[PDB]
Design a protein around this ligand. Structure first.
Ligand code: CLA
Ligand code: CLA
Ligand code: CLA
Ligand code: CLA
Ligand code: CLA
Ligand code: CLA
Ligand code: CLA
Ligand code: LMG
Ligand code: DD6
Ligand code: BCR
Ligand code: PQN
Ligand code: SF4
Lengths: 216, 79, 79, 119, 131, 659, 86
């Protein structure tokens, strides 16, 4: 439903009625070295004096006004100032080098501070801030050094692992592999091999029980 | 309600975090540089945007940049 | 020498200098040959460190890999 | 004594003026390579290829999975379903498989977005 | 039906408990569960029920508490005798300076005192274990 | 990644050797192999350093002439080939027609002389052999890389039939990460057998070289005299040989403790740690192992710094006024660096290695420490405050009373405890003698007491900062979620009252200043008591004596080195005195002025460059766009400037005063 | 780019969103709290790392966390003006 404005490239739009009356300064974008731009377009009922994020002051035309800047930060600061002046129709666009216009700030036409339907939480974590897993617990894994990006299931699993590994007296020590029984990959069923592994594990457990009960 | 579709992981939202697809221009702007243009009658302009056939600097670092995103990670919808 | 130390001037400490240099050109050349061998080996080691381990080797490299019997015994013993 | 200064006359310049200058020029040239510092600069083709090689190797093919280690995932899942059945609140429609899938999935599209540069 | 925060916490608790038991079990393999890591070496459980096992004594686990006590007492006596004789009541420094050799008995004997100490801690451990 | 700024170089250089942070370093196998290869390269560098020292002694120096008259002669380090020196007239370092030379203040001459070097040919043979050893080290690195690659290939090619084949993933780096076998062989062969071998070397080479009359090697070469032989003013060589024999035997015995090659013999370190007071810890943690090694190395470096000076082990080393001070200061600084290193790596271990249990569980030593970290820090702060208050107050009382001209009004607390310990040691030594030890016992006075309490203050405050960093690394009341963030991060924002220097790396940065201070205090104490024992004893009770009789008085030769009158052999020391002062002052800039001002200044400079006519058409600024140094980068750079200036401005002073 | 994460302790007061200098955050419907809304961070690519959201967060410890990632710095997170990486 939202319509993206034409917003011609600033190099093409040398003089326009939309541009507000502003003094000009050296704080404007460097045209020789940069090509990406940000355009802010709003509509004003009256000419209110306002301060350009790039140097001096300006006067906004009664009607449609359009300004060009280098950074979304400058555009957003100007938008905040306009909101203070009660101009809620302002929109921000990012202009690529080739003229593509991306509508940015009122992303869905509703200001971010106001709740809107169809919005789903992004980068949201379902636990308190200290609920994150320990960084040392997930090492040499996907989240090698980013414990604040682990999924809730991974956090829960790691927490359960740290609880489990406190009970030292009854922890199954992994049997040492028999390096002699190594064969080429080229040289059955997955379930059958799992069952055989389970028989081997039970044999190991029985042997361990006998060995420990020998002297105790 | 976001029209953007994440290319890497469809379940997740687009990295851009925008809700309106971009608008392509009628004719994309061509590469240009600001130079002088002698007026042929003794005059001369300072910042005249003139076409440039290729990249101004043909370094791999310069040419690898497409501007689709921070890492050019936006899907085809970015263009 | 023009000593600048109080103790040196007081006690007459001296920096005796030999009449002939300790080593000859041939000896310096031999030491430089050894240093050149060290440099070649060090460049090779730096390249190996830069590129790290190559787990793809099992796909194309000759042979089928080998583990020394002592290494196998260490593995069986564990940590 | 000091007749070995002919060695110094060739080595001290060659070592402290020529070699450092060559090294500096080579470092500047190397800085502009595709993989300048691939082990500390994210989003490098060489780093991505090395990671893919590790994944190709059989032992390490799934060593990056945080949940790796379960010998019998089916048995683990069956026990978890039994536990949830016993602990289920009355009139609960939450199933163990669905809950595990939901917890595994999350919405973090900005994690390591530089992977695109490499691929 | 709505899954409330209380229900999610209940699911988390049940998952934690059950899967922690599973990880303790032999069905889960982790680098921390190797020999030399957290778990005790197979067949040699050092601590059980919060009490030292005979395996903490290594090769002395087969020695009875009585003979361990006798050995500890004898070693303590012999080592203390050797140490006192070497240091105070029969000094050897003067003889060695003169050029004579030490009294080899005192040096070997004196090592028995720390051996006697550790043999008492082993005797206590064995006795406390019912052996 | 083409999109980069000039901070790329600093970001990379800050973690070039942080192998754990490397991209595509998938596993502990890669980590351990890389570390092993780096260790081999490091050994090669050390051997090349030894070979270079030996070569320069052999070629540019006067070892043969020095060994004839060691007392008045001064060793030569190396020649000076610097075009910038004056060519019209001879330099202060030449004999008016001779190559310029530098005196050597490393004691390597005494080391070689008492080791048994008699001719420059032997030094040349050693230079050659150590270069060969460097070659061997590099080749061993290559060999081990190849062997580990061959095991990965094997594991890829062969697989155990059962699904447990993935268990082999853990044992690929067993050779590098095994602890029992490494401990046994290190303590038995690398230490004990090395000591026995050096005893053999002494008996075969050093004893005959020192002794003018020939005598067959026998037990007569093993003795238990004590103290310093009068002639060489050094420990009897025969005693050093017995010393090393005894230590070697003891450590060879201790090297059978653990089970290394077979499980039939030896005990396990896991088992000892489990059954001992310290419950257990991540012995596999490379950072923890590094911390323990660094702590041990620091204590040993301090021990050698003290004992080389106390009991002279090298021929005529005591006679060298400058070399003694240089050695003591060098090894004191190395020891301080290693101590603070151990603390920093313990903090890193806590950050990214320790697997903390659940909060209420208290089973491991680290968890027990974290339970009462607050009490630990509060008590350490109390001790530091007490020491500082009372030391400074007594010093200021003495200062004011001396300024008013009444020494009798000074507070002079006699060091009764230290004097009693010293008297007991002297009683034991006198009994042994009845059955000389120079510098092992010193007069000890109230000035010594005050300086010792100052050094205790320095140590306590350094440990306070380091312990606070380590115990707040994982979390803190100000920043509870500090585990997620890296070891060193800039800040947490101006919110919550402001969060400058909130990271464990920032605690290290802070403790570095203290280390330097406490080391400066130690070095000043040693140097002052060494230069003027009597003046130090009488006047060291008030700080004006330190400021006037030590610094201002002894600064004359250095500053007078080069002037309008001329130059002498200390001119280089005078230029490095000022260069290091300038480096310190520069470090002040990065320490005081922070990043926003400099980023805006860089923006203005970049604007000027982009507005310049010729430069704009060539340089866009897109690639490696200039930026101001990050907060942590600037903290580190300012700390490096501060440390370099502080450390490097002292050696010129000590050389000038003791030469 | 930096990582801006939101935790369920969020109460939906919108102060983070209002303090955002480059509009990285937005309130979204939720049922976890009484306000029936929780801040989200869809446009984390524009986050500069000023931690003004963190300053404005009321909760005892922050329900919004900004993790700085100096290795993954982009032009948007660096606020580059004179130079362009696009
Ligand atoms: C690490 C030990 C070391 C050090 C610190 C020095 C230092 C010096 N040497 Mg050298 N030198 C060394 C070993 C060393 N040397 C060895 C083993 C030899 C025997 C081949 C020589 C032979 C030699 C001669 C013949 C001369 C010097 C001279 C010099 C001076 C200027 C440098 C030069 O011309 O090098 C030239 C020497 C080499 C290129 C040989 C290799 C030197 C070492 C092994 C390099 C080690 C590199 C290090 C580990 C890492 C560098 C990293 C880098 C990227 C920053 C300077 C005092 C000159 C002098 O006395 O001037 C008054 C001189 O004429 N040296
Ligand atoms: C520090 C104290 C200490 C303690 C508490 C233990 C405890 C143990 N050790 Mg021992 N051990 C120690 C030091 C210690 N060890 C040292 C220093 C070594 C190196 C020599 C060893 C080497 C060692 C091995 C190889 C083995 C043990 C084993 C054992 C177990 C049986 C002990 C036994 O039967 O002793 C009673 C036996 C004796 C008192 C006779 C010992 C005689 C030899 C020659 C050693 C004495 C050396 C002496 C102290 C130093 C001489 C110095 C020199 C100047 C003369 C037990 C857990 C065994 C075990 O079950 O391991 C799992 C095992 O296999 N230990
Ligand atoms: C303009 C001033 C100036 C300059 C340019 C030099 C230049 C030199 N002096 Mg010096 N000198 C000066 C003033 C100056 N001096 C003054 C005023 C005095 C007092 C009168 C002296 C007294 C003096 C003495 C007594 C000696 C020298 C020596 C030297 C030579 C050192 C060679 C060497 O080994 O470098 C190697 C340099 C280093 C190892 C230091 C490097 C430090 C930087 C920060 C780099 C650190 C490494 C890092 C990893 C970066 C690597 C980058 C690289 C790979 C590109 C060199 C020709 C020595 C000589 O003759 O040598 C043969 C020597 O013995 N000078
Ligand atoms: C930055 C680190 C650093 C530096 C620069 C120095 C510098 C110095 N140390 Mg050292 N030292 C350090 C750290 C350092 N130390 C630390 C951490 C410790 C504590 C462990 C010590 C402990 C120490 C002692 C105890 C002594 C020194 C001494 C010295 C001087 C060197 C003498 C020399 O090289 O003789 C040249 C070397 C030789 C003639 C022979 C070296 C023999 C070794 C064993 C060679 C290596 C063996 C080889 C690998 C074997 C091959 C394998 C085969 C056996 C199978 C010099 C002041 C000595 C000193 O003060 O002298 C006056 C001295 O006595 N240091
Ligand atoms: C790529 C860069 C790099 C480089 C150049 C080095 C260089 C070094 N590392 Mg390595 N290391 C690296 C990366 C690197 N490391 C990384 C990324 C890690 C992972 C955290 C490690 C982890 C690591 C560990 C765990 C250790 C080393 C050590 C070493 C040394 C190797 C051997 C050597 O020559 O020691 C020469 C050293 C000597 C001649 C001195 C020997 C004396 C030792 C150090 C002290 C022994 C004390 C003892 C335990 C207790 C005594 C008790 C007594 C007081 C009663 C050397 C300083 C070892 C070392 O010595 O650390 C201090 C060591 O233990 N490194
Ligand atoms: C001469 C300069 C100076 C002085 C007087 C102090 C004083 C102090 N520092 Mg130190 N400090 C200094 C420079 C100085 N610092 C520098 C340059 C840095 C680097 C940034 C630090 C970094 C630093 C840290 C990080 C810490 C200290 C601490 C302390 C206290 C140590 C205990 C003490 O002496 O209490 C007695 C008090 C005095 C001597 C001050 C004089 C009081 C009146 C006039 C008497 C004390 C308040 C520690 C602390 O707070 O311990 C409780 C601490 O944690 N300082
Ligand atoms: C001695 C200490 C010291 C030094 C050297 C500097 C240096 C500087 N400060 Mg200052 N500064 C200091 C302390 C110091 N500061 C402290 C403690 C603070 C905290 C309050 C500040 C705070 C501060 C601010 C806030 C600002 C400065 C500025 C400057 C710059 C002034 C302009 C300029 O560069 O001209 C002179 C430069 C020099 C004298 C540097 C040395 C040049 C030598 C003599 C020649 C080099 C020879 C050769 C090429 C060297 C090659 C070496 C290589 C081969 C190894 C300069 C980099 C201003 C600036 O950047 O303006 C542009 C600025 O805004 N400083
Ligand atoms: C000469 C004798 C007297 C002086 C002795 C030396 C000076 C004293 C030592 C300095 C004190 C601190 C030492 C600790 C070192 C590790 C600290 C560290 O990595 O943190 C330094 C930190 C690491 O970086 C930080 O890491 C964090 C993760 O922990 C985060 O990622 C941060 O964002 C990141 O900034 O900061 C830096 O990046 C610093 C910038 C480094 C710039 C250096 C480039 C120029 C190098 C030229 C010199 C040659 C270098 C080789 C030397 C040759 C020697 C043979
Ligand atoms: C190729 C070929 C064939 C062949 C052949 C033949 C006959 C080849 C013969 C080759 C021949 C005859 C090669 C001599 C080399 C001598 C060298 C390298 C000496 C170096 C010596 C050095 C580097 C010494 C250096 C120093 O130590 C010195 C001396 C003094 C010291 O102060 C130090 C220095 C470093 C300065 C076949 C078998 C017929 C058929 C086959 O099909 C193909
Ligand atoms: C004499 C002669 C000759 C030759 C000559 C020459 C040519 C020489 C050269 C020389 C040289 C030119 C030398 C150099 C050297 C160097 C060195 C010796 C170095 C080394 C290094 C090291 C040891 C280390 C390294 C490292 C680093 C630093 C970093 C990281 C990595 C590594 C670890 C690797 C001839 C045969 C012709 C003839 C006969 C005679
Ligand atoms: C001076 C200063 C600067 C400005 C200094 C900068 C940006 C570094 C200046 C560059 C020096 C002169 C080195 C550059 C030398 C060559 C350009 C090297 C090029 C070689 C590359 C290939 C590595 C800061 O950015 C800053 C930030 C935070 C706290 C304090 C400070 C601070 O004090
Ligand atoms: S930017 Fe600097 S002053 Fe501001 S909070 Fe961070 S460290 Fe402190």
């Amino acid at each position: 439903e939202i319509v993206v404005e034409s917003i011609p490239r600033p190099e093409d739009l040398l003089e326009s009625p939309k541009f507000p009356m502003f003094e000009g300064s050296t704080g404007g974008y460097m045209s020789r070295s940069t090509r990406e731009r940000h355009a802010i377009t709003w509509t004003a009922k009256d000419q209110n004096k306002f301060e350009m994020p790039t140097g001096g002051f300006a006067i906004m035309n009664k009607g449609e006004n359009l300004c060009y800047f280098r950074k979304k930060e400058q555009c957003i600061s100007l938008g905040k100032q306009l909101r203070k002046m009660k101009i809620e129709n302002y929109k921000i666009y990012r202009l690529k080098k080739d003229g593509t216009v991306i509508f940015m700030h009122p992303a869905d036409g509703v200001f971010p501070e106001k709740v809107n339907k169809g919005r789903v939480q992004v980068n949201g974590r379902p636990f308190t801030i200290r609920g994150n897993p320990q960084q040392s617990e997930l090492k040499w894994t996907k989240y090698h050094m980013k414990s604040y990006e682990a999924d809730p299931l991974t956090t829960l699993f790691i927490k359960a692992r740290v609880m489990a590994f406190q009970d030292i007296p009854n922890l199954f020590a992994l049997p040492q592999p028999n390096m002699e029984e190594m064969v080429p990959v080229e040289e059955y069923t997955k379930q059958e091999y799992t069952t055989r592994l389970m028989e081997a594990l039970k044999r190991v457990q029985d042997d361990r029980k006998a060995k420990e009960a020998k002297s105790l | 309600s976001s029209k953007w579709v994440n290319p890497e992981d469809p379940e997740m939202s687009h990295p851009s975090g925008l809700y309106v697809l971009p608008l392509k221009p009628a004719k994309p702007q061509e590469n240009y540089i600001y130079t002088w243009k002698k007026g042929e009658d003794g005059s001369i302009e300072d910042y005249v945007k003139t076409p440039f056939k290729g990249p101004e600097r043909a370094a791999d670092y310069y040419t690898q940049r497409k501007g689709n995103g921070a890492w050019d990670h936006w899907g085809p919808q970015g263009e | 020498r023009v000593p600048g130390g109080k103790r040196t001037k007081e006690l007459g400490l001296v920096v005796p200098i030999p009449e002939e240099d300790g080593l000859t050109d041939g000896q310096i050349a031999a030491l430089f040959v050894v240093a050149l061998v060290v440099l070649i080996a060090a460049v090779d080691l730096a390249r190996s460190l830069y590129f790290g381990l190559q787990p793809n080797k099992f796909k194309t490299a000759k042979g089928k890999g080998s583990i020394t019997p002592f290494m196998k015994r260490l593995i069986e013993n564990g940590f | 004594y000091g007749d070995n200064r002919k060695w110094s006359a060739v080595l001290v310049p060659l070592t402290t003026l020529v070699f450092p200058a060559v090294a500096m020029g080579s470092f500047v040239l190397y800085s502009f390579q595709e993989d300048a510092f691939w082990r500390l600069v994210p989003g490098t083709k060489r780093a991505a290829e090395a990671e893919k090689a590790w994944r190709e190797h059989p032992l390490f093919k799934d060593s990056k999975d945080p949940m790796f280690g379960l010998l019998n995932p089916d048995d683990y899942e069956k026990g978890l379903e039994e536990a949830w059945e016993r602990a289920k609140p009355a009139g609960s429609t939450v199933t163990v498989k669905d809950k595990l899938k939901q917890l595994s999935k999350q919405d973090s599209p900005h994690w390591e977005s530089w992977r695109s540069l490499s691929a | 039906y709505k899954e409330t925060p209380a229900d999610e916490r209940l699911f988390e608790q049940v998952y934690l408990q059950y899967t922690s038991e599973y990880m303790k079990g032999p069905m889960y393999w982790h680098k921390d569960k190797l020999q030399g890591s957290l778990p005790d070496y197979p067949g040699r459980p050092m601590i059980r029920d919060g009490k030292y096992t005979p395996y903490v004594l290594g090769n002395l686990k087969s020695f009875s508490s009585n003979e361990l006590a006798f050995l500890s007492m004898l070693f303590f006596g012999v080592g203390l005798y050797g140490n006192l004789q070497f240091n105070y009541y029969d000094p050897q420094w003067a003889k060695v300076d003169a050029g004579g050799y030490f009294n080899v008995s005192y040096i070997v004997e004196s090592l028995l005192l720390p051996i006697s100490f550790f043999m008492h801690i082993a005797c206590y451990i064995q006795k406390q274990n019912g052996k | 990644n083409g999109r980069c700024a000039t901070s790329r170089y600093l970001q990379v250089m800050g973690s070039i050797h942080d192998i754990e942070s490397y991209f595509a370093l998938d596993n502990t196998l890669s980590l351990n192999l890389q570390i092993f290869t780096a260790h081999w390269g490091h050994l090669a560098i050390i051997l090349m350093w030894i070979s270079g020292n030996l070569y320069h002694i052999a070629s540019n120096a006067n070892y043969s002439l020095w060994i004839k008259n060691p007392i008045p002669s001064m060793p030569i380090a190396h020649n000076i080939w610097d075009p910038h020196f004056t060519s019209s007239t001879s330099t202060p370092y030449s004999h008016t027609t001779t190559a310029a030379v530098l005196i050597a203040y490393s004691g390597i001459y005494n080391q070689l002389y008492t080791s048994g070097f008699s001719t420059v040919n032997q030094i040349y043979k050693a230079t050659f052999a150590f270069s060969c050893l460097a070659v061997i080290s590099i080749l061993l690195a290559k060999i081990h890389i190849r062997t580990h690659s061959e095991v990965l290939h094997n594991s890829a090619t062969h697989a155990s039939q059962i699904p447990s084949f993935f268990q082999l993933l853990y044992f690929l780096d067993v050779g590098i990460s095994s602890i029992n076998i490494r401990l046994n062989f290190h303590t038995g062969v690398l230490v004990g057998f090395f000591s026995i071998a050096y005893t053999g070397h002494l008996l075969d080479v050093a004893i005959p070289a020192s002794r003018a009359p020939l005598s067959h090697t026998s037990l007569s070469y093993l003795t238990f005299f004590g103290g310093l032989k009068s002639d060489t003013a050094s420990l009897y060589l025969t005693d050093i040989a017995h010393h090393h024999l005894a230590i070697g035997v003891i450590f060879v015995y201790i090297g059978h403790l653990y089970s290394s090659c077979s499980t039939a013999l030896g005990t396990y370190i896991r088992d000892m740690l489990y059954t001992s007071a310290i419950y257990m810890f991540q012995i596999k943690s490379l950072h923890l192992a590094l911390s323990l090694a660094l702590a041990g190395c620091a204590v040993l470096t301090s021990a050698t710094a003290q004992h080389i000076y106390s009991l002279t082990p090298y021929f005529y080393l005591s006679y060298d006024y400058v070399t003694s001070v240089t050695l003591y200061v060098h090894h004191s600084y190395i020891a301080s660096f290693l101590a603070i290193a151990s603390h920093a790596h313990a903090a890193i271990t806590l950050v990214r290695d320790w697997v903390a249990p659940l909060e209420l569980e208290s089973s491991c030593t680290i968890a027990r420490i974290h339970t009462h970290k607050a009490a630990i820090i509060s008590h350490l702060s109390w001790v530091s405050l007490w020491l500082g208050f009372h030391t400074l107050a007594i010093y200021s009382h003495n200062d004011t009373n001396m300024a008013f001209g009444s020494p009798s009004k000074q507070i002079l607390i006699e060091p009764t405890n230290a004097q009693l310990i010293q008297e007991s040691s002297g009683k034991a030594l006198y009994s042994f003698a009845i059955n000389s030890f120079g510098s092992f016992i010193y007069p000890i006075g109230p000035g010594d007491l005050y300086v010792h309490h100052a050094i205790a203050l320095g140590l306590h405050v350094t440990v306070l900062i380091l312990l606070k960093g380590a115990l707040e690394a994982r979390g803190s009341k100000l920043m509870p979620d500090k585990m997620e963030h890296s070891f060193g991060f800039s800040c947490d924002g101006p919110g919550r009252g402001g969060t400058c220097d909130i990271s464990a790396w920032d605690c290290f940065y802070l403790a570095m200043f203290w280390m330097l201070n406490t080391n400066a205090w130690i070095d000043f104490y040693f140097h002052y008591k060494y230069l003027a024992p009597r003046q130090f004893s009488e006047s060291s009770t008030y700080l004006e004596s330190w400021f006037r009789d030590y610094l201002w008085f002894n600064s004359a030769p250095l500053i007078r080195a080069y002037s309008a009158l001329g130059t002498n052999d200390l001119s280089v020391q005078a230029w490095f005195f000022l260069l290091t002062h300038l480096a310190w002052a520069t470090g002040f800039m990065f320490l005081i002025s922070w990043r926003g001002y400099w980023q805006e200044l860089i923006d203005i400079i970049l604007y000027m460059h982009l507005k310049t006519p010729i430069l704009i058409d060539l340089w866009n600024g897109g690639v490696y766009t200039p930026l101001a140094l990050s907060i942590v980068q600037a903290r580190f750079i300012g700390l490096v400037h501060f440390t370099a200036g502080l450390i490097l401005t002292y050696p010129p002073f000590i050389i000038s005063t003791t030469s | 780019s930096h990582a801006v994460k939101i935790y369920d302790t969020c109460i939906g007061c919108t102060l983070c969103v209002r303090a955002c200098p480059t509009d990285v955050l937005e309130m979204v419907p939720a049922t976890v709290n009484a306000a029936k809304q929780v801040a989200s961070s869809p446009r984390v690519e524009d986050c500069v790392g000023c931690k003004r959201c963190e300053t404005a967060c009321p909760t005892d410890f922050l329900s919004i966390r900004v993790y700085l990632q100096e290795n993954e710095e982009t032009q948007y997170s660096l606020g580059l003006d004179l130079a362009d990486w696009s």
